[PDB]
Design a protein around this nucleic acid. Structure first.
Lengths: 123, 851, 981
DNA sequence: GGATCTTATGCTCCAG
DNA sequence: CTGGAGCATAAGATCCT
């Protein structure tokens, strides 16, 4: 699959082995849409910004036709929230799931629980 | 059983010499080696003289081989000197010069033997096998580059883990339940079957079928129990038994308990009241139904997976570790012994026998009483026939005490049945004539002493040189044996051991005080010398009970040392002491770690000094500088120079010798620093060396590397020695308190009594277990003979009315199952009065006892 | 194979063949044919035609057609057919009739030091000698002919007259009767040579001088310097030169009794000295001291002129380096180590060899981490020594012990457990970076919540390393031909190694070794494939073989083994490794060699070379000679004999001289005397403050002697933690239970579900696999559930309070958590420990002194229970004031109170029937026996005696310290036993 | 004059 | 810092002729 793509991204020394192996361990061998989405999310966590909108993922296409390689099954996968909610790596926080998605935002569960902790502390 | 002389001994064909204790095995083996080198004896001699290259003398112990080679080289040298001088004072060499024909050729032959003597065939069995394999690699089918590897324990543990992983994982909960009940883990499995795995895989009595599996066995057991459960739940509800005075009428509680015991067939436990279906129990309390015996026959048979799992492990892990060792390229001692055995068993074994017979047409095996059946099969298949090739077996079956190590006396039994020649020796050099008479009386007090007529004890005569040996304690003389009966008539093992230890310390301190004032004389004719603390010695079977007597001796201010020390040096305080010193010198910036290392007993400081050191900033800075320089000298020039610098600067090499008892600690430090240095020879890094040290502290290895050396020969004190390490030595005064004690065996493993094979039994056969008990008693008899023959002047064991059954004073004592009880009570349950009478029946001015 | 003459080879090979047996056999056959071609090429010449030579033993019937097929094959390949055996004779024939100086030949050549040459080479030099000038420099210890004798027609030819350089001629004395009588024996060699030293040791030299004297075109002269018979070594050299005998044998009683015919010896000679040592360490120590001794004694001596010979260099060199580095500067002497194993960059060599064992390794965590310990790999994959501690703790607590992947596991016929693998650990690491432990499992893997911060890139780098390792362990498994093996070396080295300044030497060495091996393979044109196992151990065999004979005469002392064909004169020569069995170095032949089954004059074996080396080593001494060997192994104090050579030398010394005092006593007494002569072998300052935290009192009393170390003088014996095991835990013992046991207990105290907590541990990989973990889980369930019902029925909802009292002029501050109105209810899964009830006893008084009516209870496993009644405030402080005194007393002095063993002693003595202390000796006898059983542990349990805190203060127990521990304990352990209910 | 029955108490190696 | 053994018991203690 796109393992050669992720390793040439490694060799381009633009992004992190942390985010690469994080994407591998949260994607496994399932849908390449989920793999590339998790790769971008792990990278964005790699710099250290606490959130990411879906518009960035669906509008960047960093160095590859990500949409063209992510469309895999019946229907259309531009509905990224459904495409990731179908994966067990993305959920709405009711389950011990790596990625949070409720309000068009995707990032780590640690940042989500800390953000909601300080939010309900101030409110 | 003809009386043997090396002058007239036939040097032809198979032999068997019974050389008893103190018979000079070295002297006889040396004299007959000289005889084979010279070709002397005439008709009884070998038809041709032999070079030193063609004389195979294999011996059990490497130190024994070295000492034997040195003594035989000395014999060669002094015999050639006596041949060149035509006169001598040794009677053996005088009659040898009378027997030899041509002095010039004899002296030339002895010169050639002395010059070629360095490469004489003297090995251990393992080395000898390896050398023949390296010679005939083509006939043996073995490689060329092989090493000596001794840690098979790790590979055995890995093979056990492999077997447990691949034959026990997908099994269900109920099978896991019974296997977990019978043993916990692979550690427990290894601890169970290690002694079975080592050596050669024995013969299993009634092996299970190959196709039988755990699921089918469990189905058999569950069917076998549900049928009888259905039968009893059908036939419940009637009474026939006799309501006796002992048989209460409220015995229906047992029936109600069985009725509530009808619960399920998926359990495993049964009721105590289920055993009351015995007609023999009805005899205390009319079968009338077949169930009254169906219950009994199901109860009388044990049910487990134990036999199947043990057979699977013993059939799998041996070949598994063998294949993995072959792939790694390592070799084991038993491994190439079995390789030679298989090569001889192959079709080329005749060619191997021809080659070995042509190379060495003689072999003279020493210490035959500890040999292996594979070794005997090799010796038979190579040298059992075809004369002009001699074979002389020399051993002594009365001193074979390594059955737990993997020896066998029935192998010697088969060899003795296979050989015709039998001889013995009389001149017991090491013992006093009183001791000789005493042991003759003790082993002739009852006929069939060894419980076998096939190993008869032949009485011997002491040497005429040692007739003047007499023992004196406080004026008058003492008998050669003087037992000790305590202030009790039936006692437990704890107070038993404590009281013989207390009286032991009492006579030891009396004897040493009398020797200090010159009244306890170990005297020989007109010669007289006092007794000291290294002159007295004590034997003991196990290390905890050795510590038990050690505690009493060290309480009564006799210093005591344990010369069978199996403890590792890594367990003492010095190992972790070196650990904190190395960790503090690796990073001398950490104040807490540096303070912790400085505050120990390695330096010898005081708490006030540490408290003042905690405040002196300049002193702290200069000691930080000192340890920083030590770090520099470490990473610059290795391990020992910083240690040498530290001891020399601290004067602790003086201080620990000044303080009492510090010598032992300091020589432990020296030994561990040395071993650390050849560890760090390969371990180039420092953190790797630290991790290695930590690993060896957390794993108390019991190899020969980490054994603590003897402290000092200059200091003299009493020695506690185990019975096995006392083999082949001498001791002036011995003490045997604990040989009256015994231990009943329970594991089912016995030897065939007529066909001489090792029988592995997994059932509860009464014949199996009591044959095991009988041969265990024979083993204890052999240790008794060894212990009594290792004395010189006076042996004083302890007579005791020992009891193991719960009834303390029941009239019949329980001494009958020990070696002392078997040789004293003739095989009869006795009392204290009968013990006193049985002692005084043999008591006549040489054997006696005191309270 | 299958020619009906290779039957035994077919038996050897067809049983199993992974080319290892083939490789061993090829190497040994190549060695044997090399020896054949260099020594006895007539056999090869006969084998070329296809016949054998009579009088030869077995295995020739297959050793011959093998060589025939070999030469046929190498002629078929198109390689040159020319070699030493088929060219030397044609060289002789071409050279014997030609011009004087054919062009290109050197003007003259020289041979020095060489004492063993092949007969074919000496014949070649003999034929070459008719053209140029050749000088031969042989060092025989004697002057006259001490060689063998062939035939009566040969001894007539032995009347060649040996000139000097200028003056006149000389040869062996007594020309006629020496060859007449039994000196030159009829079949044997010379036996009336006198010196048994020469007679037994010059086995090689005798045949060499016989072969040298057998050349008809010889021109033999000599330059024999005489020796002055002044000391023992010079007397030995004179006796070995002049070929005489001085050993007294005692022909008659007069000769045996009179002992003046020998030469008396100086009682203070230091030239030849014998020594016996216990250990090699002490041996080299004695050598260093004696070396400094004669260096002090002789000002005209340098360490450059002194040599030391060793038997095995590897077994001795660490001792040499250690003692000569630990020597102080004022007693320093320089040392140079030569001929040892060439070990330059041992970590990277170990890493490379372990890397070549990749496709069959089980991937032990400790093994791969020791591989990672190489700084080259650390710099290549940017993981730092700071990060090693983090990685060690992470792979310890995550529990990685087994191989990398489930495919790797299943390749070894093992069940794919899916746990305790490297992929499992990396998944746990990254999921713990993502999540929290309170969340639980995600894909049946618990998240490890230690690694959460910026430090998480180390495990990503480790994951990249492990992915590379998996890729290369898949790559290296397949066996390929040498053409495919050509670039994989370079690819491997650049892929797993970063070229730095230190690395470059090992880089070049590995590259050229691999290039040489594959160049040999290319030159011989291998066609088939080869497994990696042959290449790996061949690299090992060509990398361990290279010694360093480089540093010889730098100026320090010379440390080298007795290399053959090397005899250089010096002043002091020392000998090491003269033990029996190690010297001379025994080496059995290859078994199927024909040289052992049929000898010749030009024979060279290891034993003969060692004896010859020892003899010319004795010759090489000029001033002093040192002999040492291990005689008494200190382990069993057994007697070990020296070597046969040194034994013969000391016997000759004993039979050749006598001490000046005892002139005429007896030969035996003289030799015994000279053999004895030559052989030698606390009150502390503290003031109590008025503010004391409650935890300080809690930490104090739980272990009194430990608390003395860890705050007063601030010493804690924090040793390192245990090493990572090698196996998954199939059984759980020790502290592994206690954390799992307690967390299971807290679930049932609140009566919450335990099935969620079961699967949480099941995702964590700590339980045994399969139903075994489940079965072990059931046993822990049924034991806590018994304990829980006892706790639950007595449990009421309580709350914490802050405590603030003041006793002994000292304020007491702290907190008392979760106390209910009836009192204190605590629970801990252990046994009845004295300190455990004491721990609540401290908490009981502070609750009872500040009002708070109510008793305190404690529940444990195995039906244990601690229960204390309440008292008034005035009595609560009264016990507490003594306990506050026990702090400042314990703070200043290490109070002698054993927690449990002191309690075990006082349990027997104290009687609650009379509520007092007993004094009867019979019950006191029970207390002493119970004390030692409480102090020292059983066969399996650890007693309180084996404690590092207590081991520092004392090692043994005295009867006065026996009572001293009891007496201080009896003051403070009375309230627990008097109030127990 | 018979029991069950639950405790205190005893007792658990050797050598490469 | 923390954690630790099983098994065969007979005396005594009550239940029942």
């Amino acid at each position: 699959k796109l393992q050669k793509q992720l390793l040439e991204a490694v060799e381009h020394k633009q992004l992190r082995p942390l985010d690469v192996q994080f994407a591998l361990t949260v994607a496994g061998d399932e849908h390449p849409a989920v793999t590339l989405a998790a790769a971008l999310l792990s990278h964005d966590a790699g710099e250290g910004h606490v959130c990411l909108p879906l518009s960035r993922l669906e509008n960047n296409e960093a160095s590859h036709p990500l949409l063209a390689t992510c469309v895999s099954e019946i229907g259309e996968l531009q509905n990224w929230e459904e495409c990731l909610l179908a994966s067990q790596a993305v959920s709405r926080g009711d389950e011990p799931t790596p990625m949070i998605l409720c309000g068009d935002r995707l990032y780590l569960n640690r940042m989500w629980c800390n953000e909601r902790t300080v939010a309900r502390f101030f409110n | 059983a003809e009386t043997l002389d090396p002058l007239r001994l036939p040097l032809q064909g198979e032999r068997l010499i019974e050389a008893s204790a103190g018979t000079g095995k070295t002297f006889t083996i040396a004299a007959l080696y000289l005889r084979l080198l010279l070709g002397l004896g005439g008709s009884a001699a070998f038809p041709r003289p032999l070079t030193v290259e063609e004389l195979l003398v294999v011996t059990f112990t490497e130190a024994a081989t070295a000492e034997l080679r040195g003594r035989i080289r000395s014999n060669i040298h002094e015999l050639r000197i006596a041949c060149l001088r035509e006169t001598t004072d040794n009677p053996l060499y005088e009659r040898l010069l009378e027997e030899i024909d041509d002095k010039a050729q004899a002296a030339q032959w002895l010169l050639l033997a002395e010059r070629q003597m360095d490469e004489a065939a003297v090995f251990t069995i393992h080395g000898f096998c390896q050398r023949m394999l390296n010679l005939n690699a083509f006939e043996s089918g073995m490689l060329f580059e092989q090493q000596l590897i001794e840690d098979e324990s790790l590979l055995r543990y890995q093979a056990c883990a492999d077997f447990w992983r691949r034959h026990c994982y997908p099994l269900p909960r109920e099978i896991a339940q019974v296997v977990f009940e019978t043993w916990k883990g692979p550690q427990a499995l290894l601890r169970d079957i290690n002694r079975y795995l080592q050596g050669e895989a024995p013969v299993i009595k009634a092996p299970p079928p190959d196709d039988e599996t755990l699921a089918s066995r469990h189905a058999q057991i569950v069917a076998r129990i549900d049928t009888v459960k259905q039968q009893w739940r059908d036939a419940v509800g009637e009474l026939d038994a006799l309501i006796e005075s002992s048989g209460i009428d409220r015995r229906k509680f047992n029936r109600s308990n069985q009725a509530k015991w009808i619960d399920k067939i998926s359990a495993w436990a049964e009721e105590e009241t289920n055993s009351y279906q015995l007609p023999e129990s009805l005899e205390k309390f009319t079968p009338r139904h077949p169930l009254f015996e169906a219950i009994d026959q199901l109860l009388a048979e044990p049910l487990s997976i134990r036999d199947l799992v043990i057979t699977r492990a013993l059939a799998e892990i041996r070949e598994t570790v063998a294949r993995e060792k072959r792939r790694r390229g390592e070799l084991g001692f038993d491994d190439m012994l079995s390789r030679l055995d298989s090569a001889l068993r192959s079709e080329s074994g005749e060619v191997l026998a021809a080659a070995i017979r042509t190379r060495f047409p003689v072999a003279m095996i020493d210490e035959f009483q500890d040999t292996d059946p594979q070794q005997y099969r090799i010796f038979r298949r190579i040298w059992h026939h075809q004369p002009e090739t001699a074979l002389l077996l020399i051993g002594d079956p009365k001193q074979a005490i390594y059955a737990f190590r993997g020896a066998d006396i029935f192998t010697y039994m088969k060899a003795r049945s296979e050989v015709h020649a039998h001889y013995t020796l009389d001149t017991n050099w090491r013992s006093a004539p009183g001791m000789v008479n005493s042991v003759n009386k003790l082993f002739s007090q009852t006929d069939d002493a060894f419980m076998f007529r096939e190993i008869p004890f032949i009485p011997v005569k002491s040497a005429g040189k040692n007739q003047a040996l007499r023992f004196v304690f406080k004026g008058e003389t003492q008998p050669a044996m003087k037992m000790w009966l305590m202030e009790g008539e039936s006692c437990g093992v704890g107070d038993y051991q404590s009281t013989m230890a207390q009286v032991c310390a009492a006579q030891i301190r009396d004897w040493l005080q009398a020797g200090q004032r010159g009244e306890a004389l170990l005297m020989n004719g007109d010669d007289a010398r006092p007794v000291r603390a290294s002159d007295i010695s004590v034997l003991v079977r196990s290390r905890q009970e050795a510590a038990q007597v050690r505690d009493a001796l060290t309480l009564l201010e006799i210093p005591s040392v344990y010369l069978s020390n199996r403890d590792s040096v890594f367990e003492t305080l010095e190992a972790q002491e070196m650990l904190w010193l190395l960790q503090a010198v690796m990073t001398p910036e950490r104040e807490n770690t540096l303070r912790s290392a400085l505050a120990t007993s390695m330096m010898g400081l005081n708490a006030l000094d540490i408290e003042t050191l905690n405040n002196d900033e300049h002193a702290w800075d200069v000691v930080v500088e000192e340890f920083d320089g030590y770090r520099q000298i470490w990473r610059k020039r290795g391990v020992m120079p910083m240690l040498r610098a530290l001891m020399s600067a601290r004067n602790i090499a003086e201080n620990l010798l000044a303080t009492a008892g510090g010598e032992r600690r300091l020589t432990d430090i020296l030994h561990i620093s040395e071993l650390l240095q050849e560890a760090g020879t390969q371990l180039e890094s420092e953190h790797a060396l630290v991790r290695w040290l930590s690993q060896h502290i957390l794993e108390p290895d019991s190899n020969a590397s980490s054994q603590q050396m003897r402290l000092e020969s200059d200091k003299h004190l009493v020695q506690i020695v185990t019975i096995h390490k006392s083999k082949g030595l001498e001791y002036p005064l011995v003490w045997l308190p604990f040989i009256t004690n015994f231990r009943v065996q329970e594991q089912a493993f016995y030897h065939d009594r007529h066909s001489f094979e090792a029988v592995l039994d997994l059932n509860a056969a009464p014949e199996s277990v009591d044959l095991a008990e009988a041969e265990r008693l024979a083993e204890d008899l052999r240790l008794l003979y060894v212990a009594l023959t290792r004395s010189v002047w006076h042996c004083s064991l302890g007579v005791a009315p020992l009891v193991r059954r719960r009834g303390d004073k029941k009239g019949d004592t329980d001494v009958h199952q020990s070696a002392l009880g078997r040789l004293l009570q003739k095989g009869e349950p006795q009392d204290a009065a009968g013990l006193r009478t049985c002692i005084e029946a043999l008591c006549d001015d040489d054997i006696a006892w005191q309270t | 194979l299958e020619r009906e003459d290779f039957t035994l080879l077919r038996h050897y090979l067809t049983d199993d063949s992974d080319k290892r047996k083939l490789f061993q056999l090829s190497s040994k056959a190549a060695d044997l044919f090399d020896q054949y071609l260099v020594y006895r090429p007539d056999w090869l010449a006969q084998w070329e035609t296809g016949h054998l030579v009579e009088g030869l033993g077995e295995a020739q019937a297959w050793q011959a057609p093998l060589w025939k097929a070999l030469v046929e094959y190498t002629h078929q390949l198109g390689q040159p057919r020319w070699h030493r055996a088929n060219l030397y004779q044609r060289f002789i024939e071409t050279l014997e009739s030609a011009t004087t100086c054919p062009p290109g030949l050197p003007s003259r050549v020289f041979i020095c030091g060489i004492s063993a040459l092949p007969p074919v080479y000496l014949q070649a030099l003999q034929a070459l000698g008719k053209h140029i000038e050749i000088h031969l420099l042989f060092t025989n210890p004697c002057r006259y002919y001490w060689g063998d004798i062939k035939d009566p027609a040969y001894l007539a030819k032995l009347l060649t007259r040996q000139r000097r350089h200028s003056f006149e001629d000389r040869e062996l004395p007594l020309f006629r009767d020496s060859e007449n009588a039994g000196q030159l024996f009829n079949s044997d060699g010379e036996q009336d040579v006198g010196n048994p030293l020469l007679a037994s040791w010059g086995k090689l030299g005798r045949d060499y001088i016989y072969l040298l004297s057998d050349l008809e075109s010889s021109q033999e002269l000599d330059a024999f310097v005489d020796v002055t018979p002044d000391n023992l070594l010079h007397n030995i050299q004179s006796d070995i030169l002049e070929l005489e005998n001085r050993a007294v044998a005692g022909v008659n009683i007069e000769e045996f009794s009179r002992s003046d015919n020998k030469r008396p010896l100086d009682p203070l000679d230091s030239s030849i000295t014998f020594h016996v040592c216990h250990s090699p360490q002490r041996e080299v120590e004695v050598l260093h001291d004696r070396l400094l001794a004669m260096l002090e004694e002789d000002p005209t001596l340098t360490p450059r002129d002194i040599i030391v010979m060793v038997a095995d260099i590897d077994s001795y060199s660490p001792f040499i380096q250690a003692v000569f580095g630990s020597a102080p500067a004022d007693r320093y002497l320089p040392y140079a180590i030569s001929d040892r194993r060439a070990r330059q960059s041992h970590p990277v060599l170990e890493a490379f060899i372990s890397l070549l064992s990749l496709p069959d390794s089980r991937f032990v965590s400790e093994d791969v981490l020791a591989l990672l310990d190489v700084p080259v790999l650390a710099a290549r994959f940017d993981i730092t020594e700071e990060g090693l501690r983090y990685l060690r703790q992470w792979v310890n607590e995550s529990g990685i012990r087994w191989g990398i992947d489930d495919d790797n596991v299943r390749e070894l016929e093992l069940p794919a457990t899916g746990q305790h693998t490297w992929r499992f650990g990396l998944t746990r690491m990254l999921l713990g970076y993502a999540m929290e432990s309170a969340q639980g499992e995600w894909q049946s893997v618990l998240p490890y919540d230690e690694s959460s911060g910026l430090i998480a890139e180390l495990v990503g780098h480790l994951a990249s390393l492990l992915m590379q390792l998996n890729i290369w362990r898949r790559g290296l498994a397949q066996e390929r031909p040498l053409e495919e093996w050509l670039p994989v070396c370079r690819d491997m080295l650049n892929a797993f190694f970063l070229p730095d300044a230190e690395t470059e030497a090992a880089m070049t060495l590995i590259e050229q070794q691999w290039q040489a091996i594959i160049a040999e393979g290319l030159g011989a044109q291998y066609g088939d494939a080869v497994p990696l196992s042959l290449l790996r151990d061949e690299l090992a065999q060509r990398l361990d073989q290279e010694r360093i004979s480089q540093r010889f005469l730098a100026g320090p002392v010379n440390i080298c083994t007795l290399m053959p064909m090397r005899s250089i004169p010096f002043k002091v020569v020392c000998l090491l490794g003269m033990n029996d069995g190690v010297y001379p170095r025994q080496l059995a032949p290859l078994g199927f060699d024909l040289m052992s089954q049929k000898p010749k004059r030009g024979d060279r074996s290891r034993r003969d070379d060692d004896r010859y080396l020892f003899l010319e080593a004795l010759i090489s001494a000029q001033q002093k000679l040192y002999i040492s060997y291990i005689g008494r192994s200190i382990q069993d104090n057994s007697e070990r004999f020296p070597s046969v050579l040194v034994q013969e030398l000391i016997d000759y010394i004993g039979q050749s001289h006598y001490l000046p005092g005892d002139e005429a006593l007896n030969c035996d007494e003289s030799e015994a005397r000279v053999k004895a002569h030559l052989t030698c072998l606390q009150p502390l300052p503290f003031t109590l403050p008025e503010t004391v935290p409650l935890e300080t009192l809690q930490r104090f009393w739980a272990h009194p002697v430990r608390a003395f170390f860890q705050m007063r003088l601030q010493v804690n014996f924090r040793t390192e933690d245990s090493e990572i095991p090698d196996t998954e835990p199939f059984i759980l013992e020790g502290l592994s239970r206690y954390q799992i046991n307690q967390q299971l207990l807290n679930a049932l105290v609140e009566q919450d579900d335990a099935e969620r907590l079961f699967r949480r541990f099941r995702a964590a990989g700590d339980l045994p696999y399969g139903a075994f973990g489940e079965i072990f889980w059931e046993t822990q369930c049924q034991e806590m559930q018994q304990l829980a019902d006892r706790v639950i029925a007595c449990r009421q909802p309580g709350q914490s309070m802050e405590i603030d009292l003041a006793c002994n002029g000292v304020q007491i501050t702290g907190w008392l958590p979760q106390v209910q109105p009836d009192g204190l209810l605590r629970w801990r899964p252990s046994l009845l420990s004295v300190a455990q009830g004491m721990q609540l006893w401290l908490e009981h008084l502070v609750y009872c002194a500040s009002g708070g009516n109510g008793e305190s209870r404690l529940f444990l496993r195995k039906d244990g229970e601690w229960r204390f009644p309440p008292l008034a405030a005035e009595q609560a402080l009264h016990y507490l004031s003594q306990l506050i005194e026990g702090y400042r007393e314990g703070m200043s002095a290490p109070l002698l109170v054993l927690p449990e063993s002191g309690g075990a002693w006082l349990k027997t003595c104290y009687d609650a029937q009379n509520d007092a202390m007993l004094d009867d000796d019979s019950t006191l006898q029970k207390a002493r026996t119970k004390f030692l059983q409480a102090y020292e542990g059983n066969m399996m349990v650890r007693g309180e005696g084996d404690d590092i805190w207590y081991q520092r203060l004392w090692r043994q127990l005295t009867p006065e310290t026996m009572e001293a521990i009891v007496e201080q304990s009896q003051r403070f352990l009375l309230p627990l036993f008097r109030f127990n209910q």
